[PDB]
Design a protein around this ligand. Structure first.
Ligand SMILES: [Fe+3]
Ligand SMILES: [Fe+3]
Ligand SMILES: [Fe+3]
Ligand SMILES: [Fe+3]
Lengths: 344, 344
């Protein structure tokens, strides 16, 4: 009855990666003291920062890194049929130097998911962590993509556009392996002139813009005309802006499609046929206003559920959707739209 | 019946500025052959580019640089009661160097608008062109803001955020003079990583994001708590995304408001009380979807109309709103909302 499309399991220590790195790269952790950097100059102004208070546990363990707490607190407690692990490994994809090392960690992150998460539970599905280098990412996708519980290539949203023709081999590898594209913000997003907007509360209100840029980038570069069977899940960008983007791009393309002649359809088509959007973070939306938005969308196949466990704005699956919506809709958003996406 | 809030008068050539510049800066046009730069690597793939086919006339004159044609084709032809001239002078405001000269051009642009446009027709109103530097921007507002037909300070949208405390002296100087803030895109907006997104059709699709950052920046830096009678006109960024941003910022703020303790109201109160949005460019929208957007806004006082004369996606007043809406809403969008905004 419910498929969770955004779960952030984690490593509890950078040392969890040493057992999967070649001996060259083991040194960067053991001897050269490599730690992952995040560039966001701010965070949630609350105790427990980005997490639920009850996700840390008693062993001082980073939330999301304890498999057993994941099982109890989320999979069992909230009756999850299938959870799509997102990871907390975006750092390797949005890395700004040491790209060779970054590719090594990508493979290392995926070994850790397969061996310490996917293989320990049938309800867990995985996303492939990739470096941004298209050659290495195709090489990683070919490596762990054949895995049966691997459903998604994770294109972490950074300060570049995935739909650029340089990354087109990565989409082809994912279609050649029956995978969807997941897309989730990273913490490094900046905006015009590269500024962070001074406050986390402002940065948080802005970052759906980066999601919007990626859908424009996928559509205008003809990614969906080249691979019309590829689907892309936008995870945690919201969805209330979606009818606006559909209308704007349709109107833009009615006058000017000759600039990108490889785009054969109307942009709102690729929204219905090739893209899914998570409902998290859910905000109090009346059932009248929610149904308006579905109607402005022209489909009920486009929304999916996610909890974002273990993050502070966690959404519980029986407490989020407006109660007055049809059970048919309720089941499509809670289960069917995702199940179709992941061939589940 | 109609107040047009986006009209783009222009100079015919950089020699129109020379009478209004000091001798020092005359030389930059006379001897050093200065020409404004725009950085956009693309434009509309169409004959006439960004302009209407009938806007050039037969003089080879730049569209919108011809007072008499603007009168016949726009003010008279479409029966405009008041036009808010927005100019095409954002280059001075979004200048990236030679700032001292940029201030001088700002004044010369305003001198041009006053002497050759505002003082030649009573249905015309003006925006104040400013340099970005807040000291000299205040100097210019003080100098030309007392002109009886100047209703707006033009805060041209580039690759920075106007809500920054750096700029608050400009906000204050507008309110002290009884002027609103206009906010219109530049040619020079980029996005994540400072990229342009390869095709003008993509760039068109994305530049509403920059409007989104401006309204976030205004709220979170407390511009409207500092000046609660100050109103801002987002002109040509669209409006169908207004509901999503009001709810996104309201959800953020319920939980994180102590980060910005100067923000005393709810974000969506500022949207209703402090912000006004243009309808251009108008995309077909059903009557019910349009009314659902207004219900979602919680106010019928936020939408205004503009033609965007002389650009290629010009809207005509008798033919843009949903033909099924009440005369009460039609008059509020076409006239009343702007008339309250500009104390007209
Ligand atoms: Fe997430
Ligand atoms: Fe989150
Ligand atoms: Fe305009
Ligand atoms: Fe325009």
């Amino acid at each position: 009855k419910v498929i969770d499309t955004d779960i952030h399991h984690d490593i509890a220590s950078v040392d969890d990666l040493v057992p999967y790195l070649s001996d060259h790269w083991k040194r960067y952790i053991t001897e050269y003291n490599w730690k992952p950097i995040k560039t966001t100059p701010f965070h949630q102004v609350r105790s427990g920062t980005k997490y639920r208070g009850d996700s840390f546990g008693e062993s001082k363990r980073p939330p999301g890194s304890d498999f057993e707490l994941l099982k109890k607190q989320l999979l069992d407690e909230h009756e999850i049929t299938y959870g799509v692990l997102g990871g907390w490994f975006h750092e390797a994809t949005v890395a700004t130097g040491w790209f060779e090392f970054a590719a090594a960690r990508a493979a290392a992150y995926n070994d850790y998911t397969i061996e310490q998460w996917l293989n320990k539970d049938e309800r867990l599905l995985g996303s492939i962590t990739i470096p941004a280098d298209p050659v290495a990412a195709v090489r990683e996708i070919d490596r762990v993509g054949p895995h049966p519980q691997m459903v998604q290539v994770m294109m972490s949203i950074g300060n570049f556009a995935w739909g650029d023709p340089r990354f087109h081999p990565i989409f082809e590898a994912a279609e050649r392996h029956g995978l969807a594209i997941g897309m989730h913000l990273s913490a490094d997003i900046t905006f015009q002139g590269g500024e962070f907007l001074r406050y986390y509360v402002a940065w948080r209100a802005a970052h759906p813009q980066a999601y919007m840029t990626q859908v424009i980038s996928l559509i205008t570069n003809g990614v969906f005309d080249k691979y019309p069977n590829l689907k892309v899940a936008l995870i945690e960008g919201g969805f209330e802006w979606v009818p606006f983007m559909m209308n704007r791009m349709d109107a833009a393309y009615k006058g000017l499609r000759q600039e990108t002649p490889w785009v054969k359809r109307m942009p709102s088509d690729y929204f219905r046929d090739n893209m899914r959007f998570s409902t998290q973070p859910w905000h109090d939306i009346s059932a009248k206003h929610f149904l308006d938005i579905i109607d402005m969308m022209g489909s009920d196949k486009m929304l999916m559920f996610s909890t974002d466990y273990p993050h502070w704005d966690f959404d519980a699956p029986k407490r989020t959707l407006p109660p007055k919506i049809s059970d048919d809709l309720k089941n499509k958003i809670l289960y069917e739209n995702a199940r179709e996406l992941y061939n589940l």
